Amino acid sequence: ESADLRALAKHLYDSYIKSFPLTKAKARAILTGKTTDKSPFVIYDMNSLMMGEDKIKFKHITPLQEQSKEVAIRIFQGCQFRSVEAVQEITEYAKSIPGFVNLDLNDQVTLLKYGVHEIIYTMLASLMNKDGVLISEGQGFMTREFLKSLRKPFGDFMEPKFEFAVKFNALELDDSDLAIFIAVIILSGDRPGLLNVKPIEDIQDNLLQALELQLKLNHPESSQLFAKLLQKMTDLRQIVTEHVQLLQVIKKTETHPLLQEIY
Amino acid sequence: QLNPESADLRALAKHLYDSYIKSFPLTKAKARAILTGKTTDKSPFVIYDMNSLMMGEDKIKFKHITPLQEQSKEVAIRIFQGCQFRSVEAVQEITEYAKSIPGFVNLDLNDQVTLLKYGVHEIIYTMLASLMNKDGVLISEGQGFMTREFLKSLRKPFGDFMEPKFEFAVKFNALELDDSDLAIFIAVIILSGDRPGLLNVKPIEDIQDNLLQALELQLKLNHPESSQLFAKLLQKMTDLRQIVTEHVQLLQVIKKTETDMSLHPLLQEIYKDL
Ligand SMILES: *C(/C=C\C/C=C\C/C=C\CCCC(=O)O)=C\C(=O)CCCCC
Ligand SMILES: *C(/C=C\C/C=C\C/C=C\CCCC(=O)O)=C\C(=O)CCCCC
C-alpha cells in the first residue's frame, strides 16, 4: 500500500495548491528576496499603514466607513475579514480529503467548526518570519515590532503567534508536508459533539500513515520529525484557546449589524 | 529482522521499564489486578459516601495521609489534603525515575529543574489513569477505592477537581497501554525541549529524539495490530496540558475561597509561573 500512501499524498498536495493561492513555497520566496523582483510594501509604522491603505489598497476590509479612526482596531478587524476568506478556502480543501464528504453532514460541520483556527495558525506560520507577517496576498509585510506597538490587547494578539511560528517553521516543512498535516488536523476524532467517530479516525489513520511516509521520503535526514510535528498540535490548542480569550477580553472596545452578524 | 541499530533501542526500553518498576510501587499491572477483581486478597474497601468514608479510616489504614489534622469540618478538604500529599509523593517518585533517564542528570542543573517543573503534572495524570476506571480510582496504595460519584458530589469547588481526570483516563485507558510502554512515554514527556525557560534546548532534544525512537519500536513490537498507536499516543499529550492548566485555574480559586488551606511548598514551587 506504499503507492497508495503516495497517491493520497499527491492528491492532497494537488488539492492544497488548487485551494490556497499563497503557498509556503511562495511566501518563503518573498520574505527573503530570492528571485521575485517586486518587493512588498513594508508596514512598519503609522504613515506606513495609512499609505498602505491606498497602495495595497487592502480597502477590501478597510471600507465600511464606520471605522478608519482607530488603528489598532482596523488592524485586528482586518484579520477577522481575512480569516473568513481562509475558512472557505479550508472548507473546499476539506472536501478534497478522501472520505470527508462521505461522512455525516453534521460531523463535517463540527470538524470544520473546531478545526479552522488550528489550520489558520498553521498556515499563518508559512506567511511570517521572526520579524514580521505577510499580508494581503503577500503584497505587503507588517513588521513585528509594529504589532506589539499596538495598545490594549491588540499587541499581545499576534506576538504569541510569532513565538509559535518560530518553533513551527523550525521544522522546515513545505507544502507537500503541510497539505497532509492539514488533513490530519481536520480529521480530529475528539471534536466535541461528533456523531460517528469511527469513520473519522479511520480516515485520520490513513492520513497519519501517509504523513509519516511523506516525512521520511522528503526528509531522510530529519529524525523523528513525524513525532516532533504531532507534538506541535499541543502548541496550537494553547495558542487557540488563548486567542479565543482575548476575543472575549476584547469586547470592551466599542466595535453593519449585518457585518457583525457576518462574523 | 532484528538489526544492530534497533537493538540499542531495545536495551533502552528495557532499561527504563526496569527503572520504572523500581521507582513506582503501584504499577498499572497491579492496579489492574486489583480493579478487575482477579483476587480474594487484593480487594479494596470501596468509598462512595460519608458512612463508607467514615469506615475508610476504620479499614484502609490512614497514618493521616492528610497529615496533622484530627479533622476539618469538611471531608472535601480532608480529601484534598490527602490528594495533595499523595501528589507530593508522586513528584518524589517521578523524580527518582527521571534521574535514571540516560543523559538527564548530565544536563544543566537548572534545566533539569525546569523539565521537572512542567513534567510532573503531565506525568502524574498519565500514571493516575492507571489507577482508574470509568467508575472510580484507587487510593492508599490500592487498599481503597473512591468512587467517581462521591468525589463528584464533594462541594462547589472540590467537586470539580477529578472529573477532567476521569475524562482523560477513559479515553487514555482505551489505548490499552501497559507499564513497559508507559515507562518510555513518561520519559519522553520529561525530555521535552519546549518547556518555558529551557536554557539549553538542543541536548534535551537529542535525548528525546532517542526516547521517541524507543517508544516507536516498543509500540510496534508490543502492539503489532495497533495502527498508529504511536501517533494516537502522542496526540494525548495535548489532552494533558489542558488538564494541567484546568487544574491551575482550579487551585487559584481555592486559594481565595479557603485562606485556611495550606499547600505544600514543593507543590507551590511548581505552580508559581505555570
Ligand atoms: C491575522 C490573524 C490571524 C490569522 C487570520 C487569517 C490568516 C489567513 C490565512 C493565512 C494564509 C493562507 C494562504 O496563504 O492562503 C494576521 C494578519 O495576517 C494581519 C491582517 C492584516 C489585514 C489588514
Ligand atoms: C488526587 C486524587 C485523588 C486522591 C483521593 C483521595 C485522597 C485521600 C487519601 C489518599 C490516600 C493515599 C494514596 O492515595 O496513596 C488527584 C491529583 O491531584 C494527583 C494525584 C496523583 C496520584 C498519583
Swiss-Prot record, chain B:
GO biological process entries: BMP signaling pathway; cell differentiation; cell fate commitment; cell maturation; cellular response to hypoxia; cellular response to insulin stimulus; cellular response to low-density lipoprotein particle stimulus; epithelial cell differentiation
MF-aspect GO terms: alpha-actinin binding; arachidonate binding; chromatin binding; DNA binding; DNA binding domain binding; DNA-binding transcription activator activity, RNA polymerase II-specific; DNA-binding transcription factor activity; DNA-binding transcription factor activity, RNA polymerase II-specific
GO cellular component: a single term: nucleoplasm
Outcome of substituting K22R: More than 50% loss of ubiquitination
Tissue: Highest expression in adipose tissue. Lower in skeletal muscle, spleen, heart and liver. Also detectable in placenta, lung and ovary.
Residue numbers binding rosiglitazone: Q84, F85, R86, S87, H121, H247, Y271
Numbered residues of crosslink Glycyl lysine isopeptide (Lys-Gly) (interchain with G-Cter in ubiquitin): K22
SUBUNIT field: Interacts with FOXO1 (acetylated form). Heterodimer with other nuclear receptors, such as RXRA. The heterodimer with the retinoic acid receptor RXRA is called adipocyte-specific transcription factor ARF6. Interacts with NCOA6 coactivator, leading to a strong increase in transcription of target genes. Interacts with coactivator PPARBP, leading to a mild increase in transcription of target genes. Interacts with NOCA7 in a ligand-inducible manner. Interacts with NCOA1 and NCOA2 LXXLL motifs. Interacts with ASXL1, ASXL2, DNTTIP2, FAM120B, MAP2K1/MEK1, NR0B2, PDPK1, PRDM16, PRMT2 and TGFB1I1.
Role according to the record: Nuclear receptor that binds peroxisome proliferators such as hypolipidemic drugs and fatty acids. Once activated by a ligand, the nuclear receptor binds to DNA specific PPAR response elements (PPRE) and modulates the transcription of its target genes, such as acyl-CoA oxidase. It therefore controls the peroxisomal beta-oxidation pathway of fatty acids. Key regulator of adipocyte differentiation and glucose homeostasis. ARF6 acts as a key regulator of the tissue-specific adipocyte P2 (aP2) enhancer. (Microbial infection) Upon treatment with M.tuberculosis or its lipoprotein LpqH, phosphorylation of MAPK p38 and IL-6 production are modulated, probably via this protein.
Domain writeup: The 9aaTAD motif is a transactivation domain present in a large number of yeast and animal transcription factors.
Protein name in the entry: Peroxisome proliferator-activated receptor gamma
Gene: PPARG
